[PDB]
Amino acid sequence: SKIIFRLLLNVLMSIIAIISYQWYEQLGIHLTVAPFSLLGIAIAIFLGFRNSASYSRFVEARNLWGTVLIAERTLVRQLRNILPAEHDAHRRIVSYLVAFSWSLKHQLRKTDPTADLRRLLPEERVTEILASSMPTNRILLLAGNEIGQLREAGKLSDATYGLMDNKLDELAHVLGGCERLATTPVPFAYTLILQRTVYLFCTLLPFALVGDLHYMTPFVSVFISYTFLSWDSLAEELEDPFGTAANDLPLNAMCNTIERNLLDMTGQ
Amino acid sequence: IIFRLLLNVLMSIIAIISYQWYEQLGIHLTVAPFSLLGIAIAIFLGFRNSASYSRFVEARNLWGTVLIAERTLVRQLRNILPAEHDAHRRIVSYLVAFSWSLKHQLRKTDPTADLRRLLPEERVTEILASSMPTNRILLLAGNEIGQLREAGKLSDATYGLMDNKLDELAHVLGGCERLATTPVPFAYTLILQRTVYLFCTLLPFALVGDLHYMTPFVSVFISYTFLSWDSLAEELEDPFGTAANDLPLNAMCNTIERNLLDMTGQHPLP
Amino acid sequence: KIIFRLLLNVLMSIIAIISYQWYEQLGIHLTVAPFSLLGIAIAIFLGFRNSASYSRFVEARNLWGTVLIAERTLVRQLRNILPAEHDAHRRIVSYLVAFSWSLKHQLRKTDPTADLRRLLPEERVTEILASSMPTNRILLLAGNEIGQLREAGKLSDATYGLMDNKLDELAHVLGGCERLATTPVPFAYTLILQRTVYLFCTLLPFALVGDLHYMTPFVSVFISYTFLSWDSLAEELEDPFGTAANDLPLNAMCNTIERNLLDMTGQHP
Amino acid sequence: SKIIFRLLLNVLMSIIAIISYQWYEQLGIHLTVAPFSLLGIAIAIFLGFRNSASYSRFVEARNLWGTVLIAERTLVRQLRNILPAEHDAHRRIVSYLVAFSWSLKHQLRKTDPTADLRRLLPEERVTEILASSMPTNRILLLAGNEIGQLREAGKLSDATYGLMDNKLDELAHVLGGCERLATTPVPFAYTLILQRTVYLFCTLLPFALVGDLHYMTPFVSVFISYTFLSWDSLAEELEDPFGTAANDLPLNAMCNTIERNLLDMTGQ
Amino acid sequence: SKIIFRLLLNVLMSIIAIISYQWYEQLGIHLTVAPFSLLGIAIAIFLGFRNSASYSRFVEARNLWGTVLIAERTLVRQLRNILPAEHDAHRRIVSYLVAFSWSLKHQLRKTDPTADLRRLLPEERVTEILASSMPTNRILLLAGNEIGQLREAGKLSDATYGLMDNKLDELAHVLGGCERLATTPVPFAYTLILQRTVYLFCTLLPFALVGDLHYMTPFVSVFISYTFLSWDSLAEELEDPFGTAANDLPLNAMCNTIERNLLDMTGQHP
Ligand SMILES: [Zn+2]
Ligand SMILES: [Zn+2]
Ligand SMILES: [Zn+2]
Ligand SMILES: [Zn+2]
Ligand SMILES: [Zn+2]
Ligand SMILES: [Zn+2]
Ligand SMILES: [Zn+2]
Ligand SMILES: [Zn+2]
Ligand SMILES: [Zn+2]
Ligand SMILES: [Zn+2]
Ligand SMILES: [Zn+2]
Ligand SMILES: [Zn+2]
Ligand SMILES: [Zn+2]
Ligand SMILES: [Zn+2]
Ligand SMILES: [Zn+2]
């Protein structure tokens, strides 16, 4: 992993420590364990809480995408149970809903939505969408129109119109939810100080351990350092949920899963 | 888990009869650093277990909602269309199918017997055809509700009162799928799992200094405490897991099936 | 009976003191630092555990709080929307009061027939007792009152819906309570903590006595009180529908609910 | 506060402990610092969690009062956007809504609503309200009547009556909330368990510290005692958020804001 | 960061400890680590919790502002969807909504709204608003009259009027949510209780540290003093998240984003 260099720099710090041990008392430098326990504990506490934030936030990102799936399932269902005749409205609204998903993925990944949109929508609509500075939000507007048309067509009463509007309000909360997550990281200060104090602590560690361990310092100073670094490096792997790294959310697969659902619900 | 306590008891007896040669080559092991280690590990097991618990509780609430929504939906059908018992039985079928289908979905088991029992094989082929069978069942339930509305028997206002219930089931389906395919840390629950193991096997080697012949007893006390708390996290982290406790999920589906037959007068026997 | 094993710990100290003489002559040594470790780990786990229990107790308290709110405002909607319909008003209210007591009985695993017969006609009592879930049944009946008022033109779909929502909220309380009860916190959870906290407490003197000697029991009792006070509080909060000291005054809560609902419909004790 | 008494009571336990450490070996009492680390840390952890539960109880209280201002604000707003003419239902309802706030404050403060209530209401109902064992609930039932009246007087549709009924529901939940936080205190075993243990731990502490610290004992021990006592004290200035205090909710200030706010939205 | 001052000051104190260590038993002052190791872990635990409380406040504040964006977006959507033609109502309502954000941030930052207020509204209104002792709430009420007017003009039905109405309720909740976090901070028993205690501990720490560290008591004490002091002040920063510190909320960006959004392309739509 990205973790295995500091682990080794640690072994080499154990070794710089073993064969440097006697010029110690000469200088007057002595290093006991006790204050490094007070430190190491206070750091474990702060590590603990921080990781908690990181995990909460990765979970919130998962919830949010989970909701896209639930609302578009519902909204499609409602269209099938209320207007089971109109399949043109069906196919239209479904393509916007699928478009919203891909569009939001692209948005969070800062990639180009254009191919996906052109695959699902008429070119005139793609033009409308990409013209907006907020293309994903503009897709809700369009979906909202199809709904709105059916309403004044008289196919939908204000009641049933409202049932479907509420699902658009949910997609609206996913969109803001995601935008917020993507511009509001766990504050920088956390991951900075923890990263400094944890790294310092791990490299200073075999120095204040050698007096007690002698030769069995590497296999213990490593084991202690693996532990703190495995924990601090779990926050890292949980703080970019919209990424493309292995342990980020599989938004591509999720978008494919969403599209496959709404198509199962409409015969295609 | 009872296996690596013996391994611990052995690793102790190894460290006893062996911590004669340790003095040779100057290799030492205090208790202070294994106390910094262990308290940090304990702090992290704390937070980890806290996350795991939270996933367990969320799964309970979700299933909790199935019971609530289905009871309310069926109550709504009785209070609003007290006469329409053919619709009452069709919808209660789907709702009961929904729950079992869900359970089977999360446990990765075959739902066919349960579906075949509850619904006409036309609809069972249809549902089994789909790759989202539980979702398909909601859609069918929606149709029954929908048809009562075209038929003129439900107003848009009172159709809505029921449609809310199906949204509530929709949210449960999604929530559960998110928990089932959502091991938040991909195989880093594996790194932390082994970190506790190394610590519980290296520990008697570190403790033997101050305890001697008492080492296997105080080393296995401590190991059991850590291994227990850790196994508990694994059990909670995965409430629908490849080896969970089915009892409550089965209990929940039987409760809701019983509940609904009661509400629609199928019970007690005439 | 927590003073029960506070007492036993004192003797274990004595057993540790009395026998400290001949276990220099037994090849046994027991230091504090390992028990500091173990003891802190357990403290940390007790800390999180206890936290989860309080959360369950607050939820239960809160669900019950919602019975009172929902039922109050269902009655308020009955009065504001149908001021003339006092027959409905009292039937419904007798169901909602029946709902509350039945819920207490359900949670307490006790017979609701007394309280039921008191509040409702026996034909209804039988209908309700015939059911796998009498509280469910009672919501269904309250539902028909509301719903018959609708067939009869006296409630619109809109205002029927307003009241249906309240029945819906009660359903949620019912399921919530049902869940907090049929979900005793995971099996391999409490069993590990009692032994660990017990075993640790009764072994602590054997380790404390090298440092403390005759002081062992005073210190060892203090430490064990602390851990046990904490561990036992978790238990009594864990089952909030029981009859323990901080176990919700469910009878009192039920009375408050009945006095409230009677005060809204013009009646007196 | 009352704290400083047992700060000094601790300084005196320190001196007693110093000038009786000589009779220790004589009496047979050894007191090492290490078991009081295990203890003190455990007590800290339990103190940490407890304090945490009290904070959240206080926050729930603030949110509940937050909801009163919000609900009453938008109920009045809804009245002005739906029935902008009918200023005499406006004034009746705004006075009922203000009565509610005050009646709630008084109910929680376990004091007397009669003065504040007569200032706001015609006493043909002020006696009705005070003749109920649940005055504040009765004030909602009456606010409900005004809305109920406007509905059956055709000035409100079901739709619009609904929109406003939902705001009464919201106040009902605040009432329940507050009452619940009043009658169900934080489980009482928490408090006494904790400061039997905290106070007993701080008085017993110098007798174990003196072996190591000698004359430095009162300084260090008063510090440690300050810390714990402080934290434990903070938890109880938060456990009773409706109470008689300066670290409690400025309930009077909050009702004054609410009353000005509702008068301000109607032009008085 | 007023930390470097206190960090170096600690280095002073940490030298004083090194020069006066062998004169300890001459003055009668022994000072071990365990009492400070105890004291310090307790302060860690409390710092950990309090910082957790602070982040909660930050996170909620961030959430409340996220909702301004969401709710305003969908209210405009609802108006473009239900009354697609009514663009002069659209324009009026959007200005009130953009006014609402700016007005709120000024309210929370304790600054003057009038610049931003006139930038957006007719002057006859910029004083109806500035006149109320609660302006953000007055701006809402104004946005409400617009929706209400469309409703009496029969352009909106009670149903669709309600859809829009709810979105203004959602905004009333952000308003109160934000006042709650402003007016009520966390108890200022966070000098006497936390800020001063962490420091008194940090300066005394080397005096109890030297005997062990000898010639390392400025370093290890400044490492420890860093860690503790970082977390106390980060905590203090995050609790006032409408503040202007480096880790507070970007209220100004957020209001731009809201503004750019509702005026998405000079207010034009499909
Ligand atoms: Zn939904
Ligand atoms: Zn179709
Ligand atoms: Zn990434
Ligand atoms: Zn529901
Ligand atoms: Zn039937
Ligand atoms: Zn049955
Ligand atoms: Zn309610
Ligand atoms: Zn009546
Ligand atoms: Zn509201
Ligand atoms: Zn007026
Ligand atoms: Zn008049
Ligand atoms: Zn009086
Ligand atoms: Zn919304
Ligand atoms: Zn327009
Ligand atoms: Zn020196």
Numbering used by the authors:
A (entry chain A), D (entry chain D): 22 to 289
B (entry chain E): 24 to 293
C (entry chain C): 23 to 291
E (entry chain B): 22 to 291
What did the published study say regarding this structure?
In KpBest and hBest1, alanine substitution at the aperture (KpBest I180A and hBest1 I205A) significantly enhanced channel activity, suggesting an activation gate role for the aperture. To characterize how alanine substitution affects the size of the aperture, we solved the crystal structure of the KpBest I180A mutant (equivalent to hBest1 I205A) at 2.9 Å. Compared to WT KpBest, the I180A mutant displays a much bigger opening at the aperture (radius 0.9 vs. 3.2 Å) without altering the overall structure of the channel (RMSD = 0.4 Å). Consistent with this idea, KpBest I180A (equivalent to hBest1 I205A) displayed dramatically increased open probability but unchanged unitary current in lipid bilayer. While mutants with conformational changes at the aperture (e.g., KpBest I180A, I180T) or neck (e.g., cBest1 3A) do not have structural alteration at the other restriction, a mutation near the aperture (D203A and D179A in hBest1 and KpBest, respectively) impacts both gates, suggesting both independent and cooperative regulations of the two channel gates. The hBest1 4A mutant is designed to be deficient in gating at both the neck and aperture, because the cBest1 3A and KpBest I180A mutant exhibit an unconstrained neck and aperture for Cl−, respectively.
Human bestrophin1 (hBest1) is a Ca2+-activated Cl− channel essential for Cl− transport in retinal pigment epithelium (RPE). Although the structure of hBest1 is still unsolved, two Best1 homolog structures, one from bacteria Klebsiella pneumoniae (KpBest) and the other from chicken (cBest1), have been previously reported. Overall, the channel is a pentameric assembly with a single ion-conducting pathway, which varies in diameter along its length and is constrained at two narrow points: a “neck” contributed by three residues (I62/I66/F70 in KpBest and I76/F80/F84 in hBest1/cBest1) on a transmembrane helix, and an “aperture” formed by a single residue (I180 in KpBest1, I205 in hBest1, and V205 in cBest1) on a cytosolic helix. Here, by electrophysiological and structural analyses, we show that the neck and aperture in hBest1 are both indispensable Ca2+-dependent gates, and their dysregulated opening by rationally designed or patient-derived mutations causes Ca2+-independent leak and elevates Ca2+-dependent channel activity.
